[PDB]
PDB file of C-alpha atoms in Angstrom:
ATOM      1  CA  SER K 180      98.608 103.886  37.773  1.00  0.00           C
ATOM      2  CA  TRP K 181      96.983 105.262  40.913  1.00  0.00           C
ATOM      3  CA  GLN K 182      95.786 108.285  38.948  1.00  0.00           C
ATOM      4  CA  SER K 183      94.268 106.025  36.274  1.00  0.00           C
ATOM      5  CA  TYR K 184      92.403 103.992  38.911  1.00  0.00           C
ATOM      6  CA  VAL K 185      90.796 107.280  39.983  1.00  0.00           C
ATOM      7  CA  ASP K 186      90.205 108.830  36.546  1.00  0.00           C
ATOM      8  CA  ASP K 187      89.253 105.719  34.624  1.00  0.00           C
ATOM      9  CA  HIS K 188      87.749 103.455  37.302  1.00  0.00           C
ATOM     10  CA  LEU K 189      86.187 105.709  39.947  1.00  0.00           C
ATOM     11  CA  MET K 190      85.345 108.778  37.877  1.00  0.00           C
ATOM     12  CA  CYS K 191      83.792 106.856  34.990  1.00  0.00           C
ATOM     13  CA  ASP K 192      80.367 108.013  33.966  1.00  0.00           C
ATOM     14  CA  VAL K 193      77.458 105.740  34.900  1.00  0.00           C
ATOM     15  CA  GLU K 194      73.997 106.528  33.515  1.00  0.00           C
ATOM     16  CA  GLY K 195      75.230 109.968  32.458  1.00  0.00           C
ATOM     17  CA  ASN K 196      76.664 110.893  35.868  1.00  0.00           C
ATOM     18  CA  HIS K 197      79.875 110.385  37.795  1.00  0.00           C
ATOM     19  CA  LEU K 198      81.233 110.757  41.333  1.00  0.00           C
ATOM     20  CA  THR K 199      81.627 114.328  42.514  1.00  0.00           C
ATOM     21  CA  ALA K 200      85.074 113.386  43.817  1.00  0.00           C
ATOM     22  CA  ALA K 201      87.168 110.272  44.449  1.00  0.00           C
ATOM     23  CA  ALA K 202      90.512 109.201  45.863  1.00  0.00           C
ATOM     24  CA  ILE K 203      92.698 106.274  46.827  1.00  0.00           C
ATOM     25  CA  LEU K 204      94.629 106.816  50.051  1.00  0.00           C
ATOM     26  CA  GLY K 205      97.153 104.599  51.750  1.00  0.00           C
ATOM     27  CA  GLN K 206      95.894 103.283  55.087  1.00  0.00           C
ATOM     28  CA  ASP K 207      98.459 105.723  56.537  1.00  0.00           C
ATOM     29  CA  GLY K 208      96.252 108.543  55.235  1.00  0.00           C
ATOM     30  CA  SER K 209      98.561 109.691  52.410  1.00  0.00           C
ATOM     31  CA  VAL K 210      97.011 110.511  49.054  1.00  0.00           C
ATOM     32  CA  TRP K 211      98.022 108.068  46.338  1.00  0.00           C
ATOM     33  CA  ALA K 212      95.657 109.684  43.803  1.00  0.00           C
ATOM     34  CA  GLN K 213      92.628 111.946  43.961  1.00  0.00           C
ATOM     35  CA  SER K 214      90.268 113.838  41.702  1.00  0.00           C
ATOM     36  CA  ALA K 215      90.220 117.645  41.489  1.00  0.00           C
ATOM     37  CA  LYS K 216      87.470 118.228  44.095  1.00  0.00           C
ATOM     38  CA  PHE K 217      88.510 115.674  46.744  1.00  0.00           C
ATOM     39  CA  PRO K 218      88.390 117.257  50.251  1.00  0.00           C
ATOM     40  CA  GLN K 219      91.259 117.279  52.695  1.00  0.00           C
ATOM     41  CA  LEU K 220      90.518 114.804  55.460  1.00  0.00           C
ATOM     42  CA  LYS K 221      91.625 115.275  59.061  1.00  0.00           C
ATOM     43  CA  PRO K 222      93.990 112.759  60.734  1.00  0.00           C
ATOM     44  CA  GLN K 223      91.334 112.089  63.418  1.00  0.00           C
ATOM     45  CA  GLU K 224      88.814 111.263  60.650  1.00  0.00           C
ATOM     46  CA  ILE K 225      91.180 108.691  59.140  1.00  0.00           C
ATOM     47  CA  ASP K 226      91.678 107.324  62.676  1.00  0.00           C
ATOM     48  CA  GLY K 227      87.885 107.119  63.057  1.00  0.00           C
ATOM     49  CA  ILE K 228      87.501 105.294  59.734  1.00  0.00           C
ATOM     50  CA  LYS K 229      90.120 102.736  60.732  1.00  0.00           C
ATOM     51  CA  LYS K 230      88.560 102.195  64.141  1.00  0.00           C
ATOM     52  CA  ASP K 231      85.137 101.667  62.473  1.00  0.00           C
ATOM     53  CA  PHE K 232      86.569  99.032  60.108  1.00  0.00           C
ATOM     54  CA  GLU K 233      88.080  97.297  63.124  1.00  0.00           C
ATOM     55  CA  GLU K 234      85.038  97.725  65.386  1.00  0.00           C
ATOM     56  CA  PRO K 235      81.862  97.855  63.215  1.00  0.00           C
ATOM     57  CA  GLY K 236      79.269 100.319  64.492  1.00  0.00           C
ATOM     58  CA  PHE K 237      81.795 102.673  66.088  1.00  0.00           C
ATOM     59  CA  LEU K 238      80.832 105.756  64.030  1.00  0.00           C
ATOM     60  CA  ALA K 239      77.119 104.960  63.670  1.00  0.00           C
ATOM     61  CA  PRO K 240      75.748 106.751  66.756  1.00  0.00           C
ATOM     62  CA  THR K 241      77.290 110.146  65.975  1.00  0.00           C
ATOM     63  CA  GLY K 242      78.266 110.161  62.305  1.00  0.00           C
ATOM     64  CA  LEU K 243      81.025 109.661  59.752  1.00  0.00           C
ATOM     65  CA  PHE K 244      82.977 112.933  59.467  1.00  0.00           C
ATOM     66  CA  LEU K 245      84.952 113.732  56.336  1.00  0.00           C
ATOM     67  CA  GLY K 246      86.611 117.114  55.930  1.00  0.00           C
ATOM     68  CA  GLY K 247      84.605 118.314  58.935  1.00  0.00           C
ATOM     69  CA  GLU K 248      81.362 117.312  57.158  1.00  0.00           C
ATOM     70  CA  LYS K 249      78.848 115.007  58.845  1.00  0.00           C
ATOM     71  CA  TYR K 250      77.557 111.989  56.964  1.00  0.00           C
ATOM     72  CA  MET K 251      74.785 109.861  58.502  1.00  0.00           C
ATOM     73  CA  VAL K 252      76.127 106.298  58.629  1.00  0.00           C
ATOM     74  CA  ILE K 253      74.024 103.794  56.650  1.00  0.00           C
ATOM     75  CA  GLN K 254      74.371 100.009  56.334  1.00  0.00           C
ATOM     76  CA  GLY K 255      77.914  98.937  55.442  1.00  0.00           C
ATOM     77  CA  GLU K 256      79.881  95.679  55.325  1.00  0.00           C
ATOM     78  CA  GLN K 257      81.770  94.723  58.508  1.00  0.00           C
ATOM     79  CA  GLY K 258      85.443  95.616  58.240  1.00  0.00           C
ATOM     80  CA  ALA K 259      85.216  96.285  54.491  1.00  0.00           C
ATOM     81  CA  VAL K 260      82.810  99.053  53.471  1.00  0.00           C
ATOM     82  CA  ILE K 261      81.574 102.170  55.204  1.00  0.00           C
ATOM     83  CA  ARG K 262      78.628 104.031  53.658  1.00  0.00           C
ATOM     84  CA  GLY K 263      77.042 107.359  54.518  1.00  0.00           C
ATOM     85  CA  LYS K 264      74.446 109.898  53.343  1.00  0.00           C
ATOM     86  CA  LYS K 265      74.461 113.691  53.420  1.00  0.00           C
ATOM     87  CA  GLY K 266      71.378 115.317  51.963  1.00  0.00           C
ATOM     88  CA  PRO K 267      70.678 113.954  48.432  1.00  0.00           C
ATOM     89  CA  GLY K 268      74.149 112.423  48.187  1.00  0.00           C
ATOM     90  CA  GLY K 269      76.637 110.377  50.144  1.00  0.00           C
ATOM     91  CA  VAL K 270      79.896 108.451  50.163  1.00  0.00           C
ATOM     92  CA  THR K 271      81.376 104.947  50.052  1.00  0.00           C
ATOM     93  CA  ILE K 272      84.750 103.988  51.587  1.00  0.00           C
ATOM     94  CA  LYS K 273      86.126 100.573  50.663  1.00  0.00           C
ATOM     95  CA  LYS K 274      89.076  98.951  52.462  1.00  0.00           C
ATOM     96  CA  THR K 275      91.682  96.972  50.501  1.00  0.00           C
ATOM     97  CA  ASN K 276      94.874  95.216  51.701  1.00  0.00           C
ATOM     98  CA  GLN K 277      96.887  98.441  51.643  1.00  0.00           C
ATOM     99  CA  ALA K 278      94.573 101.298  50.774  1.00  0.00           C
ATOM    100  CA  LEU K 279      91.245 103.059  51.358  1.00  0.00           C
ATOM    101  CA  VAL K 280      89.111 103.848  48.286  1.00  0.00           C
ATOM    102  CA  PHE K 281      86.766 106.858  48.603  1.00  0.00           C
ATOM    103  CA  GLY K 282      83.873 107.942  46.387  1.00  0.00           C
ATOM    104  CA  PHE K 283      81.633 110.984  47.009  1.00  0.00           C
ATOM    105  CA  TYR K 284      78.428 111.358  45.019  1.00  0.00           C
ATOM    106  CA  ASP K 285      75.521 113.781  44.596  1.00  0.00           C
ATOM    107  CA  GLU K 286      72.134 113.291  42.939  1.00  0.00           C
ATOM    108  CA  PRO K 287      71.252 112.143  40.295  1.00  0.00           C
ATOM    109  CA  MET K 288      74.027 109.606  40.884  1.00  0.00           C
ATOM    110  CA  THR K 289      72.784 107.058  43.445  1.00  0.00           C
ATOM    111  CA  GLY K 290      74.275 105.291  46.456  1.00  0.00           C
ATOM    112  CA  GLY K 291      74.008 102.039  44.518  1.00  0.00           C
ATOM    113  CA  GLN K 292      76.025 103.463  41.623  1.00  0.00           C
ATOM    114  CA  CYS K 293      78.699 104.914  43.925  1.00  0.00           C
ATOM    115  CA  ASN K 294      78.817 101.556  45.749  1.00  0.00           C
ATOM    116  CA  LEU K 295      79.440  99.757  42.469  1.00  0.00           C
ATOM    117  CA  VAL K 296      82.317 101.914  41.217  1.00  0.00           C
ATOM    118  CA  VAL K 297      84.068 102.154  44.567  1.00  0.00           C
ATOM    119  CA  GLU K 298      83.608  98.551  45.669  1.00  0.00           C
ATOM    120  CA  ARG K 299      84.413  96.985  42.282  1.00  0.00           C
ATOM    121  CA  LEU K 300      87.713  98.948  42.186  1.00  0.00           C
ATOM    122  CA  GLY K 301      88.441  97.910  45.759  1.00  0.00           C
ATOM    123  CA  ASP K 302      87.812  94.275  44.835  1.00  0.00           C
ATOM    124  CA  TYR K 303      90.123  94.467  41.822  1.00  0.00           C
ATOM    125  CA  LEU K 304      92.815  96.044  44.038  1.00  0.00           C
ATOM    126  CA  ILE K 305      92.344  93.260  46.614  1.00  0.00           C
ATOM    127  CA  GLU K 306      92.709  90.557  43.943  1.00  0.00           C
ATOM    128  CA  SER K 307      95.800  92.435  42.717  1.00  0.00           C
ATOM    129  CA  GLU K 308      97.140  92.165  46.283  1.00  0.00           C
ATOM    130  CA  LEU K 309      96.706  95.891  46.892  1.00  0.00           C
TER     131      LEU K 309
END
């Protein structure tokens, strides 16, 4: 289920830590499943995310905003993965055929660990035609 993908795939503990919050949204912005602390995103932020996947580098100059919070854009994967940092922590957003997978992390969890959980789920969803 969508909730299981969040609870059991995204929120799994890695090295004793887990994502602060996670969610799988339809590309329309609707929440398919989310964890307890996932922030409400603004329509314009979802629009920005989609434009950045379509035109790599769009958000880079001024930042990736999520829930009104600024994340410094860091190296991503053109049209597939957006990554950002905010203080000790950060986020990974992975695009699938029909959804957007989000993972927010805070130290001691690392960007690499967040990248793994979020991107591996996204890849499974893609192979599952989702």
